[PDB]
């Protein structure tokens, strides 16, 4: 129970804070403002307040809560909207009955006024239960049919008593664990430190791909379930379309959209649109809100909350993975998270390393991106969850040159780079083919050989075509393109066709909102077969100009392959693509 000694912005120095611990939440002031102790010197513990520090006076009591920044994990967070800390914005608005967020608001993170249906698990009284084991299930939504209650990790012992099936709230007792004679009461929820990753038995290698939906991302630079992606922040429509595309069609059992430093009305857009979206994964259309938990942190919110939002989202995703679900946590403006870290370091007085950013920026980003990956969740039954981290980096200088971008590329597996040239052409998604990459091609070769055997060779062929035509286009812009071989002319024409029909797609269009993996494979088949057949014809001796004049119809057909509807089903569409390249082969005989 120390007292405030110094206040200067969010950083509050509290005296008499002896026996405190680093990164421990302490209630600063008379309003009980949440603050994490980030520096200790003797009996003075420097605290960063997570709320508005204006009005704090010297001598205000500071209460030590004894626990780190803990997120309340359990049923009831599957649909709600949260601040940086797990502050329920909807519950705050309902309780306060105002458009403002009161200072020091103590609304519980998970509401205790809802009765949750509970069905006890396979464990019974007397059995030995270890950390992370399942001892029940809660019917949260239609989408989340079973919110399986996990015994908190690092908590173990023998079940002294287990509750029967019935509607129980979070405050009510669910199960009791004896351990070394000290009975512990476990409820429907539990808290976990956001800094500390949630344990798993083993982190498996991510194999099954995460279908972002965008054609270029799905084909050329594929991501897998449990892999970091580093999408471009805002300039390109890759992020804006990709977030909703993943939330709608990624097959992720849960989504945790994390917006740190998101613009005010840009966050209002998400909060007002995501309820409107629906999915067809189940028999009937169901809202995405039943599958998504947003961590909404506008730029107005304090810098400490901006830094903590990423941890809150990643630990919610870790909880849903420990349940055995495949999650795709989307971090919005990881660049703004890094800027928040830089601001906090400046407040603390730490020596910046690179362009004001703290030297531990790489370490923090690595400890964040390393929470991703397919993992066998601990405790029986054996279950295999996954957390995909689709994080966004803003174009600080218009190019991938910021220290945050450098660290993210150093520690990431997939990176979809922004092309300023393609964005200025309003070519969407504006993903730069040259700088982008995906280190999951080798591991995804297994899935490709299992399902679509020709996918890797086709994407390699398209990459080769794009690179060759990029070099040839540099030479064209240099020397006027007066003289070009027939093969080179076909290369440039095919690359332009690809960049206009395959790579480019309208996210808001009905046909190209979500291009499936089979549709993308069929389109690669069409485009690569067109290029190869044109090259073969030119090698035979045909004139390219006359051949293009004769095959404009075939080129229009392979362009309308994008316009082919995906809702017709894989069986019908592939039959159409089978007939598309069947007549394409014969049309080149003339």
């Amino acid at each position: 129970y120390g007292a405030i000694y110094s206040v200067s912005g969010p950083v509050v120095i509290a005296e008499n804070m002896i026996g405190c611990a680093m990164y421990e939440l302490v209630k600063v002031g008379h309003d009980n403002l949440v603050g994490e102790v980030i520096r200790i010197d003797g009996d003075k513990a420097t605290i960063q307040v997570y709320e508005e520090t204006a009005g704090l006076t010297v001598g205000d009591p500071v209460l030590r809560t004894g626990k780190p920044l803990s997120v309340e994990l359990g049923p009831g967070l599957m649909e709600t909207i949260y601040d940086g800390i797990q502050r329920p914005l909807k519950a705050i608005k309902e309780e306060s009955q105002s458009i403002y967020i009161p200072r020091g608001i103590d609304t519980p993170a998970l509401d205790r006024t809802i009765k949750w249906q509970f069905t006890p698990g396979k464990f019974q009284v007397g059995d030995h239960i270890s950390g992370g084991d399942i001892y029940g299930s809660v019917f949260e939504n239609s989408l989340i049919s079973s919110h399986k209650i996990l015994l908190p990790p690092r908590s173990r012992g023998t079940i002294t008593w287990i509750a029967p099936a019935g509607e129980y709230t979070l405050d009510e007792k669910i199960l009791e664990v004896e351990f070394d004679g000290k009975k512990s009461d476990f409820t429907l929820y539990h808290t976990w430190p956001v800094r500390v990753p949630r344990p798993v038995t083993e982190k498996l290698s991510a194999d099954y791909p995460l279908l972002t939906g965008q054609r270029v991302l799905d084909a050329l630079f594929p991501c897998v379930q449990g892999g970091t992606t580093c999408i471009p922040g805002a300039f390109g429509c890759g992020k804006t379309v990709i977030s909703q595309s993943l939330s709608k069609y990624s097959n992720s059992d849960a989504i945790i959209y994390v917006g740190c430093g998101e613009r005010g009305n840009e966050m209002a857009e998400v909060l007002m649109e995501f309820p409107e979206l629906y999915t067809e994964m189940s028999g009937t259309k169901e809202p995405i809100m039943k599958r998504t938990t947003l961590v909404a942190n506008t730029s107005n919110m304090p810098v400490a909350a901006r830094e903590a939002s990423i941890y809150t989202g990643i630990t919610l995703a870790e909880y849903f993975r420990d349940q055995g679900k495949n999650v795709s946590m989307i971090a919005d403006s990881s660049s703004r998270w890094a800027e928040a870290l830089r601001e906090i370091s400046g407040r603390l007085g730490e020596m910046p390393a690179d362009q004001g950013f703290p030297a531990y920026l790489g370490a923090k980003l690595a400890s964040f991106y390393e929470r991703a990956g397919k993992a066998v969740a601990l405790g029986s039954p054996d279950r295999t969850g996954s957390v995909s981290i689709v994080a966004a980096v803003s174009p600080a200088g218009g190019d991938f040159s910021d220290p945050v971008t450098t660290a993210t590329l150093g520690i990431t597996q997939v990176f979809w780079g922004l092309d300023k040239k393609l964005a200025q052409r309003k070519h969407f998604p504006s993903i730069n083919t040259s700088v982008s990459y995906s280190k999951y091609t080798n591991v995804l070769n297994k899935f490709y050989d299992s399902n679509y055997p020709e996918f890797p060779v086709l994407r390699d062929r398209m990459k080769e075509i794009l690179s060759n035509a990029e070099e040839l286009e540099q030479v064209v812009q240099l020397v006027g393109k007066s003289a070009l071989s027939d093969s080179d002319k076909i290369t440039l024409d095919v690359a332009t066709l690809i960049k206009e029909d395959f790579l480019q797609q309208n996210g808001y269009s009905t046909y190209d909102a979500f291009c499936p993996i089979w549709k993308t494979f069929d389109m690669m088949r069409a485009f690569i077969s067109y290029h190869d057949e044109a090259q073969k014809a030119v090698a035979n001796g045909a004139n390219w100009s006359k051949l293009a004049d004769s095959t404009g119809d075939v080129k229009h057909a392979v362009s309308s392959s994008k316009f082919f509807e995906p809702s017709r089903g894989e069986k019908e569409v592939h039959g159409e693509f089978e007939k598309l390249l069947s007549t394409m082969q014969e049309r080149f005989a003339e």
Binding site: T57, N265, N300, G349, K426
Partner: protein, 459 residues
């Protein structure tokens, strides 16, 4: 009924002053200092100046003086702790009055007969209580409305440089801002008297002084009141737009001057700088200012914030324009090259952007073809700029047919479409028709970013 107003709280007059350094005044012995507290420094000359407590030690209070510390003695200066943050007196009659940088009357009128005392910092709006604007404002400028639309409730700044007509463009936007009447809250932070007189004269000629509030902090005014003027103007706008249910358009000008004031206060505090000396928390301060714009769920009324900004050397990469782009949504880029070429407005539509255009434009809100036309214009303008660069570097004949057509389009675009005389007031539909007339230069085949249905229905 605010019956708690009838209460007297005596204040502690501290004569214990020391460490008077630059904009900062340090008090050695303070009894329970309060952070972000307003003090009244009574000089030996007798004049009083408000001051804000930037930081408190155990018994210290580093106070920043808004009117400056020139003349502050260490012996005869008495500092009186008011006991609360700075609260501007707000009222409905506060519209139509001219205020100083610190919310003091300038028009030789009475002090604001307060309806309530509102904190400068305001309160943090619940993100769940906000409304996505999705209500386009017909700003009357072609290069804005057609290609970077402004939604009622969008914080879209005007990025400009020194000597460019950013003041003229913003005055035009304010004068003609009907939806496809607005109250105005104008905050002048360090602008020269010529610019302040221009803004006041334009508002009066258009008839805006009936529904406007100017917070004029001229260049000669003290350089720390630029920290407080945007907050006063923005809480005035928050009042007028949320409690009186008006539609307020805030025109905070020289946010670069505000950031220079921040750097001056940050430099005096001897704290960890950040980039180019600007405080590391400049992102947080700029977000606190900018993020006070938008609509709320319960109350129909918005702050269409348009913070004019001045790039020090026409560089986006500078910390002030970069952070303003990070927080404020959208940007209207005023181009030195365009102004030198003589175009008005010299708005460069390549850097200019609007995040809310895609939702506030098209699909029956304005017209079916707005978004596709604006995408086509942007793409062809970028093509024209690239073709002009290529034709400068290498021979003109090396440019393709599309490149030559795009050079012609760029000429007809800067000279006819963007070029808009003051008081012209082009409707969004007229601007779209003119943009189509520009797009009819091309054959229908190469208008690639136009959806084929719209291309058939509008070509």
């Amino acid at each position: 009924a605010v019956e708690q107003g009838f209460n007297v709280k005596p204040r502690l007059n501290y004569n214990t002053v020391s460490g008077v350094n630059g904009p900062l005044v340090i008090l050695e012995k303070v009894k329970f200092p309060r952070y972000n507290e307003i003090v009244n420094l009574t000089l030996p000359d007798g004049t009083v100046r408000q001051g804000q407590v930037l930081e408190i030690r155990g018994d210290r209070a580093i106070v920043q003086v808004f009117e400056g510390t020139s003349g502050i003695d260490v012996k005869k200066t008495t500092v009186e702790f008011t006991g609360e943050s700075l609260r501007i007196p707000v009222s409905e009659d506060m519209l139509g009055r001219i205020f100083d940088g610190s919310g003091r009357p300038i028009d030789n009128g009475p002090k604001v007969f307060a309806e309530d005392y509102l904190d400068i910092n305001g309160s943090p709006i619940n993100p769940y209580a906000r409304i996505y604007p999705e209500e386009m404002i017909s700003t009357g400028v072609s290069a804005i409305d057609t290609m970077n639309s402004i939604a009622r409730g969008q914080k879209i700044p005007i990025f400009s440089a020194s000597g460019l007509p950013h003041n003229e463009i913003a005055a035009q936007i304010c004068r003609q801002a009907g939806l496809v009447n607005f109250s105005i809250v104008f905050a002048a932070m360090g602008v020269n008297l010529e610019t302040a007189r221009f803004f006041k004269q334009d508002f009066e000629e258009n008839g805006s002084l009936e529904r406007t509030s100017l917070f004029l902090n001229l260049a000669n005014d003290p350089t720390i009141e630029r920290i407080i003027t945007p907050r006063l103007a923005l809480t005035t706008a928050e009042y007028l737009a949320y409690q009186t249910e008006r539609h307020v358009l805030t025109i905070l000008t020289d946010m670069s001057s505000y950031a220079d004031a921040l750097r001056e206060v940050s430099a005096a505090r001897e704290e960890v700088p950040g980039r180019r000396g600007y405080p590391g928390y400049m992102y947080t301060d700029l977000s606190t200012i900018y993020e006070r714009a938008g609509r709320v769920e319960g109350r129909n009324g918005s702050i269409t914030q348009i913070p004019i900004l001045t790039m020090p050397n026409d560089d986006i990469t500078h910390p002030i324009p970069d952070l303003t782009g990070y927080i404020t949504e959208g940007q209207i880029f005023v181009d030195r090259q365009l102004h030198n070429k003589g175009i008005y407005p010299p708005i460069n539509v390549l850097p200019s952007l609007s995040r809310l255009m895609k939702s506030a434009i098209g699909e029956g809100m304005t017209r079916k073809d707005h978004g596709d036309v604006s995408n086509q214009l942007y793409a062809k303008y970028a093509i024209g700029k690239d073709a002009a660069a290529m034709k400068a570097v290498v021979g003109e004949e090396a440019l393709s047919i599309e490149d030559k057509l795009s050079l012609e389009f760029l000429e007809k675009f800067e000279k006819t479409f963007i070029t808009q005389g003051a008081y012209e007031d082009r409707t969004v539909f007229e601007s779209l028709d003119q943009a189509w007339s520009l797009l009819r230069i091309y054959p229908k085949e190469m208008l690639n970013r136009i959806s084929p249905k719209i291309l058939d229905e509008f070509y």
